[PDB]
Amino acid sequence: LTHQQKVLQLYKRALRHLESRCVHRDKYRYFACLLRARFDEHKNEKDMVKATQLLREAEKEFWHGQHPQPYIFPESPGGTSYERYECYKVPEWCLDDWHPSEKAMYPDYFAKREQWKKLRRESWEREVKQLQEETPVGGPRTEALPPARKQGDLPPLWWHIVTRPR
Amino acid sequence: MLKYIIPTMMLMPLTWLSKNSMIWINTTLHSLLISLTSLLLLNQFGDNSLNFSLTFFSDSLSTPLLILTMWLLPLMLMASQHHLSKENLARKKLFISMLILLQLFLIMTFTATELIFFYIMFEATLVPTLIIITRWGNQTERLNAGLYFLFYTLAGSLPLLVALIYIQNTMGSLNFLILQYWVQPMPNSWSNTFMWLACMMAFMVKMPLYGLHLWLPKAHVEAPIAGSMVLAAILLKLGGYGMMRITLLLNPITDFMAYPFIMLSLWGMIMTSSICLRQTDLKSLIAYSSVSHMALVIVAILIQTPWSYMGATALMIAHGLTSSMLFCLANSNYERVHSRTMILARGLQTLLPLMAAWWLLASLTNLALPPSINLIGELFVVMSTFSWSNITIILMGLNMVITALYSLYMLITTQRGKHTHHINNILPSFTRENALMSLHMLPLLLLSLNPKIILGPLY
Amino acid sequence: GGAHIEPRYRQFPQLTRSQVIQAEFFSATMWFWILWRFWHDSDAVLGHFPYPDPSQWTDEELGIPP
Amino acid sequence: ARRYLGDASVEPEPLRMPTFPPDYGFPERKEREMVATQQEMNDAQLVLQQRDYCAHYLIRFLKCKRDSFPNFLACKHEQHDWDYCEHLDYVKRMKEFERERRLLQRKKRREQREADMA
Amino acid sequence: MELPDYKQWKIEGTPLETVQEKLAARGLRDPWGRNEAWRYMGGFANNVSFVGALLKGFKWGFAAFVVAVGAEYY
Amino acid sequence: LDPAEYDISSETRKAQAERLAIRSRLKREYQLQYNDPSRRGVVEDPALIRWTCARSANVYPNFRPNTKTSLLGALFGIGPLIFWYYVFKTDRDRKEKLIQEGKLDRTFNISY
Amino acid sequence: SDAPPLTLEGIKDRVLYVLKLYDKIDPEKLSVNSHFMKDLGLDSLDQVEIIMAMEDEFGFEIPDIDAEKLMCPQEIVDYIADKKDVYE
Amino acid sequence: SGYTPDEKLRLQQLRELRRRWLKDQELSPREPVLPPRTYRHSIFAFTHVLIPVWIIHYYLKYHVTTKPYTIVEKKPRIFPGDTILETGEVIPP
């Protein structure tokens, strides 16, 4: 929200739309260079209101530079992927029950997996203590998850060890 | 017919006297053994409707509907278990007893010759259902939606008895056979007005026309799955059925009197078909679906072309199996996560990869897929109604598009798009679920080979 | 598995000789065919579309109005 | 279209063509060229509007296809034969375009103005 | 495993050359990016101009076209 | 829709909106964020139950005081509906006429 | 297939490689630990450029919020390492 | 605006967890899948097609005769070349 990411975002997606504009990448280059100067003369003034003003002017002047189908790299939401594979992600709590036959189909996996079940079954008391300790009243101010000081796990780990993309 | 009346009545003490843990086995077994002879019931031939005994007989329509009932008990009861599977024995034997007795009065009703026996057995059918859904319905606040539900029925459902007895003493016999051949034209005037309106609206309360359709949704969300497959697979087809028969008389009257109701059903088909699109809480979707198809049925009844009946009855049966099954899917999804709310969980193409095929297959059979009996019936009905009015196809086919949209929308967002991953409960399938689904679809797909069984008396 | 596909970063992707053999072969097929039957064909295939010179046919001239 | 014939022949449609001649009938100077027997014309079934004069050629082309089946090319010559005959014919309807356009100009102009003298 | 090597592109004589020459005239003293100079140098950069695609295989193709009538002419 | 005006956020709106907003948010994030072992069933969150209950139309059965309501509903089921009554009765009667007189040119119609 | 994964050696060679292609600073000091700003004093707007063209090297993701604070090269390798599927 | 050092340590040891978990996740010891405890072949597929020829063709051999109207075909094209031909043609070149 600060001037930093405001300006820097406008710069970044400005380069993005500019990418989508031209072709052969060289014209994109020296145009992007003229822009590099267009923001390069900037930033050397600590005057307060003048700046945000001129920025907004770059918000309209930028908004002119949007053609409706800006280039979107595949993995983010966009017309290529954004979880093409999503029917392939099966959470590890499934397979908690397979048939003991098929549980014997792959005999050594559930060994280590059992070392995890004990890893985090032994845990969560250390976790709840550390968290209930650290949180300021209500835990309002922090969306973060600070680490553990004693030797061991980082407390809210379980979902953060994920089924991976394909 | 009496050979079908005894074996269930004997199926009552089979329940009552038995060792614990064998009640489901005994009931299911002998009930399917009933279903065999229910399939024996088809001798029907030529012209005269077969008559077993002077008290009650069967024409065609009664035979498909009856076969559907006696087939439906074992699957129903088969489905109701594990809804509880913990209680005192008295609860179990009471519940199975109630399903039995309900089936008995249903067989009475469909087979009944004489309309007063039909009527007595009619409300006598309604009571057991009420006891089922109210005594334990999972009772969200209970809504008191069994009882004043019975008031929704009787409120205007009683005076049809009056009108009947009038028909009795004027013409003598209320036997349906002799009410046929003696039926005499009734001119359009104000007395025949209140009469026709009496009988008509009296049955029209059951298959909900768009005016009264508030009847179903609450009663059908409060129903335990057995009471649901009872309710929407059958108890509407009673109203439409009796409608089929008592429209024998009222010959000219049903034109000038029909027209407003036809209008209301052609518009309400679209309206209901719409409102069922946007709702949450899956258990309701299939309900309003039932309201839609039943509106289509009423449309088929009032216009008297034989095509209209063939498609009509075909829609009674096909919608019976389809709607019933689809309910049982909603339930099989409900035991997994306790919601009733559709949007809550998702996925289940990943998980339960087989249960997909039954979701898909059933939804398609409610999508009006061409070989499916649902599209046979719906198709002939559309033919009849287009014959009646060249214009009405805008509304009809518009119902085609909407019914497509929600029928295929249910197939998604329950079944597809992501796993909500905070669930971690659902236990893969069952053999019983597959048994239920199979017992639904497999006959509905086979009937799509030799349908001439299920097409109506006129054929 | 590995076909000797040689995943490469920043240089010209390696190529199978037989492949450009195939593609070039089919280039020769397309144009060999096309100018082949272009020597076997015509873009004006028959006698030409007519002309008003017979629209005189002055023998037809009106009888009664000399 | 040389005669009206009659509907008492029990025949609507191609047994009644516009007449047995497909197109015009040419009262004009002289008759219409030769003939192709309607019975043969049916027993080799020919789509209407595929069915005209020059069929002398066409039906021979339909010979040439089943003449040599495995040959794809077969007769390019008979192909060009009904191509030529119907070339000349469509050119004939061109000449009818000519005749009538010039009749318009001549009798329109001459008779209008020289009628409007007095 | 891949052995990318390094260091040899140089931004020379390759259209980024002329780019940085115009920018040079503007006094911007280079932008960045010898990488896209990879996008130029190589077996690339000779490329093809269109109608060359419709000139791809003409040589052998209407070569054999030239010979083609040699069957009916001899 | 169309982010615009690039609000200066002032001072209160900064302090109030920021601190209070992300306050309640992070409170509830961390709230359902517990995600321990030993819960077999759903996480049950009281959210979306309000959605369901309210969208079950809690004010439906009570009443509908007039205001503009009876006008919006009555005129909402009025114009198209009753006019469709009139058109199906119209074309109805026309069809009956052309059947009973003249010709509808049905010729062979049969199954109807 | 799309066989080759990006392994730790590979990604190291890549971030390292392209940062060595960046001209305005020299290959002189480039190390996973070597500070991505404080050492080289590069423009923060210019680190926005580095993450830009490096994203265009690997072609994916890199949301603006997380791209803001990246800095040191080993760290960038880390982000690409957990976001992509990397470790043995 | 670099980071919180707390988040540096957290992210780091979370990486440790991804390390070990994925080391686990790759499975190929002992090939864990252990489920229990020229012409003639093409002529056999030619049977796979040929048995349908037997059945279906049989179904039609009794079928066609058993029922009055089916397999109704366009009357074979007849030419004046056969039977009697009337032309009288020659020309244009």
Sequence ranges of the domains in chain G: 1-88
DSSP string, F40-77: -S----STTHHHHHHHTTTTTTT----TTHHHHHHHHT
Query: Is B414 within 8 Å of B282 (Cβ atoms)?
Result: yes
| Contact list, F36 vs chain A (CB under 8 Å) | 124
Q: Distances from the Cα of A164 to the Cαs of A108, A143, A160, E1, H23, in angstroms?
A: 21, 24, 11, 25, 13
Q: Does A140 touch chain F (CB under 8 A)?
A: yes
Phi and psi of C43, rounded to 5°?
-95, -5
Written as one letter, the residue type at B190 is W
Written as one letter, the residue type at B445 is L
| Token representation of residue B228 | 């649901």
Whether A123 and A155 share a structural domain: yes
Per-residue b/e over G15-46, b at no fewer than 16 CB within 10 Å?
A: bbbbbebbeeeeeeebeeeeebbeebebbebb
Whether A65 and A94 share a structural domain: no
Q: Kind and range of the H or E element at G64?
A: helix G64-68
Query: Is B130 within 8 Å of B147 (Cβ atoms)?
Result: yes
Which of A19, A42, A70 is a domain's end point? A70
> How many CB contacts within 8 angstroms connect chain C with chain E?
45
Q: Distances from the Cα of B22 to the Cαs of B25, B205, B412, D118, in angstroms?
A: 5, 40, 39, 121
Please tell me the distance from the alpha carbon of residue B379 to that of residue B370, in angstroms, as a whole number.
9
Confirm whether A77 is domain-assigned: no
List Cβ<8 Å contacts ≥24 apart for B282-285.
B282/B330, B282/B333, B282/B340, B282/B341, B282/B342, B282/B410, B282/B414, B283/B220, B283/B221, B283/B327, B283/B330, B283/B334, B283/B340, B284/B217, B284/B220, B284/B221, B285/B342, B285/B406, B285/B410
Nearest alpha-carbon partner for B276 in B338, B216, B233: B216
Q: Does H9 touch chain A (CB under 8 A)?
A: yes
Confirm whether A54 is domain-assigned: yes
Determined by cryo-EM
Q: Distances from the Cα of B241 to the Cαs of B15, B182, B245, B246, G34, in angstroms?
A: 31, 21, 7, 9, 85
Nearest alpha-carbon partner for C10 in G13, E30, B414: G13
Identify the residue whose tokens are 């979902």: A159
Please tell me the distance from the alpha carbon of residue B348 to that of residue B357, in angstroms, as a whole number.
11
Q: CB within 8 A of E11, min separation 6: which ones?
A: E17, E20, E30, E34, E37, G23
Q: What's the first-to-final CA gap in chain E, in angstroms?
A: 61
Per-residue b/e over B159-182, b at no fewer than 16 CB within 10 Å?
A: bbbebbeebeeeeeebbbbebeee
Query: Is B381 within 8 Å of B298 (Cβ atoms)?
Result: no
Query: Is B303 within 8 Å of B262 (Cβ atoms)?
Result: yes
Please tell me the distance from the alpha carbon of residue G22 to that of residue B142, in angstroms, as a whole number.
72
Written as one letter, the residue type at B247 is T
Residue in H with minimal Cα distance to A101:
H35
Angle, helix B62-80 to helix B236-246, in steps of 10 degrees: 170
Number of domains chain B contains: 1
Give the single-character DSSP code of C48: P
Alpha-carbon torsion angle F85, F88, F91, F97, nearest 10: -90
Q: What's the first-to-final CA gap in chain C, in angstroms?
A: 97
Nearest alpha-carbon partner for A14 in A71, A53, A52: A71
Q: Kind and range of the H or E element at G45?
A: helix G44-58
Q: Distances from the Cα of B285 to the Cαs of A110, B30, D71, F16, in angstroms?
A: 42, 34, 64, 43
Query: Is B49 within 8 Å of B59 (Cβ atoms)?
Result: yes
| Contact list, E19 vs chain G (CB under 8 Å) | none
- Subunit contact A144:H4, Cβ cutoff 8 A: yes
Please tell me the distance from the alpha carbon of residue B435 to that of residue E19, in angstroms, as a whole number.
73
- Subunit contact H79:D56, Cβ cutoff 8 A: no
Residue B112, strand partner residues: B56
Query: Is B11 within 8 Å of B101 (Cβ atoms)?
Result: no
Please tell me the distance from the alpha carbon of residue A157 to that of residue A137, in angstroms, as a whole number.
23
Please tell me the distance from the alpha carbon of residue F102 to that of residue F80, in angstroms, as a whole number.
32
Other Cβ atoms within 10 Å of B65 Cβ, number: 24
Q: Which residues of G are catalytic?
A: 43
Nearest alpha-carbon partner for A157 in G68, G60, F32, H14: H14
Residues 36 to 65 of G: which have CB under 8 A from any H CB?
none
- Subunit contact A90:B350, Cβ cutoff 8 A: yes
Written as one letter, the residue type at C27 is S
| Token representation of residue F66 | 């007039």
Residue D51, strand partner residues: D48
Query: Is A73 within 8 Å of G60 (Cβ atoms)?
Result: yes
Q: After which residues is chain H broken (C to N over 2.5 A)?
A: 37
Chain E nearest CA to A54, separation (Å): 23
Nearest alpha-carbon partner for F90 in A156, B263, D53, G17: B263
Identify the residue whose tokens are 């429209």: B247
Nearest alpha-carbon partner for A36 in A11, A7, A3, A63: A11
Domain membership of residue A163 as a residue range:
90-166
Helices (H), chain H: 5-25, 39-66
DSSP-based helix, strand, coil % in chain E, nearest 5: 40, 0, 60
Please tell me the distance from the alpha carbon of residue B323 to that of residue B313, in angstroms, as a whole number.
15
Instruction: Give the total residue count for chain E.
Output: 74
Q: Distances from the Cα of G37 to the Cαs of A88, B381, G48, G57, H9, in angstroms?
A: 40, 76, 12, 20, 20
Q: Distances from the Cα of B305 to the Cαs of B325, E51, F93, in angstroms?
A: 30, 70, 18
Give the single-character DSSP code of H37: -
Chain C nearest CA to D47, separation (Å): 25
DSSP string, B143-205: TTTTHHHHHHHHHHHSHHHHHHHHHHHHHS---HHHHTTS-----SSHHHHHHHHHHHHHHHT
Please tell me the distance from the alpha carbon of residue A32 to that of residue A12, in angstroms, as a whole number.
11
Domain membership of residue B163 as a residue range:
1-459
Identify the residue whose tokens are 């820097």: A8
Chains in contact with H, counting 3 or more C-beta pairs less than 8 Å apart as contact: A, D, G
What is the stated resolution of the deposited model, in angstroms?
3.9
Alpha-carbon torsion angle B139, B141, B144, B145, nearest 10: -60
Residue D48, strand partner residues: D51
Whether A95 and A157 share a structural domain: yes
CA A144 vs. chain centroid, Å, equals 14
Number of domains chain A contains: 2
Q: What radius of gyration, in Å, describes the C-alpha atoms of chain C?
A: 31
Q: Which residues of E touch A (CB under 8 A)?
A: 15-16, 19, 22-23, 28, 31, 33, 36, 39
Angle, helix B23-40 to helix B89-111, in steps of 10 degrees: 10
Confirm whether A98 is domain-assigned: yes
Which of A70, A99, A123 is a domain's end point? A70
Instruction: Give the total residue count for chain D.
Output: 118
Identify the residue whose tokens are 């008389």: B249
| Contact list, G82 vs chain H (CB under 8 Å) | 14-15, 18
Residue in G with minimal Cα distance to A9:
G64
Chain A nearest CA to G72, separation (Å): 19
Chain F nearest CA to B266, separation (Å): 10
Residue A151, strand partner residues: none
Quick check: bond before H92 cis, omega within 30? yes
Query: Is B386 within 8 Å of B379 (Cβ atoms)?
Result: no
Written as one letter, the residue type at C60 is E
Identify the residue whose tokens are 């979707």: B285
